[PDB]
Design a protein around this nucleic acid. Structure first.
Ligand code: MG
Ligand code: MG
Ligand code: MG
Ligand code: MG
Ligand code: MG
Ligand code: MG
Ligand code: MG
Length: 224
RNA sequence: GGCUGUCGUCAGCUCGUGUUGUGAAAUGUUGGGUUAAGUCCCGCAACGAGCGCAACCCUUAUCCUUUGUUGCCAGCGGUCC
């Protein structure tokens, strides 16, 4: 990753001056047109060492999950995870899915049974009414937790989009002592994240840049 | 003990795990619509489940098939009708 490629995607952009969190005053260079400018000369070493640690953990054989739930950012997250042989969540984060795994992991078995009944020819016999409920059940259990169906246990790292919009997952992971790599704007709380990567996180270009970089480094680490 | 009346055939009453609070407790069960209904859809630090609601039970209203006595008489023969 290079500084010019970062500035080309709008990473320099931040948020307004009246919405800034003073916990990351150090990661701000200046302000123009009543908008903060992120000191990206801090961003480059952070991003590089974060990628190094991510691919090291990939070589350490630790499954990972990609967390992004924005309405205009789901496809990038799901594709970056899918073409990485890893896991993803792109809808509402079902609260407690980590700390309360014992009661959500059977929703996985329910989804699997429903999908076998779907693509096995079972949805023909019954009296043409409950198939509607079954189809909606497939739809909802696919949208909610259909991206971790083959998770098979707790993860070993988490990648987070919009630390503000995704703080419940951050607390859930912090409970379990699992490292978190998150993207933070200038209105974010960097307390729960041990590997902090500053940068704009409302533009599609920067988000897909980060996702491509992390997918590439994870494939590198698996190539070991 | 067993059995019964009533609020009231009113739509309510709880639990496991998770989270919040020093704590009694809270969330779930709140919010927008909608229904006879905690009935259903959407959103949601909650995810699921149980007793209730509804369905399964009896009878009535339409048609179909089988059997015709002690029940019936449309088409034929006789009549004490
Ligand atoms: Mg406590
Ligand atoms: Mg109640
Ligand atoms: Mg309550
Ligand atoms: Mg409430
Ligand atoms: Mg309501
Ligand atoms: Mg109910
Ligand atoms: Mg009933």
């Amino acid at each position: 990753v290079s500084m010019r490629d970062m500035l080309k995607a709008g990473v320099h952009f931040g948020h307004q001056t009246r919405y800034w969190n003073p916990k990351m005053k150090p990661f701000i260079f200046g302000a123009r047109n009543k908008v903060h400018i992120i000191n990206l000369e801090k961003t480059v070493p952070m991003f590089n060492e974060a990628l190094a640690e991510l691919n090291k953990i990939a070589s350490r054989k630790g499954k990972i999950l990609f967390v992004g739930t924005k309405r205009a950012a789901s496809e990038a997250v799901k594709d970056a995870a899918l073409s990485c042989d890893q896991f993803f969540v792109n809808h509402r984060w079902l609260g407690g899915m980590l700390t309360n795994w014992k009661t959500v992991r059977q929703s996985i078995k329910r989804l699997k049974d429903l999908e076998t009944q779907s693509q096995d020819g079972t949805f023909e016999k019954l009296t043409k009414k409950e198939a509607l409920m079954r189809t909606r059940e497939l739809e909802k259990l696919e949208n909610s937790l259909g991206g971790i169906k083959d998770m098979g246990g707790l993860p070993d790292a988490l990648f987070v989009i919009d630390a503000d919009h995704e703080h419940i997952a951050i607390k859930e992971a912090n409970n379990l002592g699992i490292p978190v790599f998150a993207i933070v704007d200038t209105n974010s709380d960097p307390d729960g994240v041990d590997f902090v990567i500053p940068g704009n996180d409302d533009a599609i270009r920067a988000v897909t840049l980060y996702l491509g970089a992390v997918a590439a480094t994870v494939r590198e680490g698996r190539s070991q």
